[PDB]
Assembly symmetry: none
Homo-oligomer: 147 residues x 2
Amino acid sequence: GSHMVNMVSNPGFEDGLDSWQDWQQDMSAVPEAAHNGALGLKIGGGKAAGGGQDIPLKPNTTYILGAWAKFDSKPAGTFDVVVQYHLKDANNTYVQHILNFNETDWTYKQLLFTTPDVFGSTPQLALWKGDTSKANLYVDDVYLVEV
Amino acid sequence: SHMVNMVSNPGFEDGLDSWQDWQQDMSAVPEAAHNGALGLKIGGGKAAGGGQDIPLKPNTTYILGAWAKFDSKPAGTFDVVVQYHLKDANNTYVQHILNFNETDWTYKQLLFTTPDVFGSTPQLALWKGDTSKANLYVDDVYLVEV
Ligand SMILES: [Ca+2]
Ligand SMILES: [Ca+2]
């Protein structure tokens, strides 16, 4: 086949938390969260928490955003995989391309988006476990792929 | 870390290389491009299509996606299909199908998981069953293991 290149650094958490910002100190790379490889990301339950990474993107370009995720118990809300950035318009409109997960079995989802001609800020890929239940969230194999 | 597209010449950037043209009704042309320099045009006036064999892995999750548009109002549809037999007693047959009838560039996708054993080599079919004068443009057909 033909490779489609993934822009995400340490996308399977195989290098632990390398390259991922940890915003609430609620992240750990652990084998119980692995979908592939030896590790996955666990975001601990009880409060909204997550992390992310800044990823410069090309203008006028289509990307696939995808991930595998599961909660270890039924959540009240969701785990969201997001690409977010400001536009370079009068208001600096903030735009988010969002995948929502609430499943308790490993589930893959993806969306596609096309970037604007100019960016108002550097795109960020955020992994945001907004659910506040005691459910733990596992996520692994994150993709941000051109084409 | 990377996706591998199982579709050969998925953006038609190498013309009709690696694609079968079943009704001699296909061309790779600039007006049919959604991305890059070329896209596939399936000519109107009769049902027609093309495809290729695709060597999928068993017990594996795949995403099928494509962009398409008719260049004029169609009567029927354009279908993108992954199809194969299972390896059970009677080689059961499944088709994973995206249907298009839009006149603006439109992206559609689906997810499927492959069986433990295949009864036949999977096929990717691009089938423009529409019989109107409308030409069909398709580009960036991909099939990725995730
Ligand atoms: Ca992993
Ligand atoms: Ca193309």
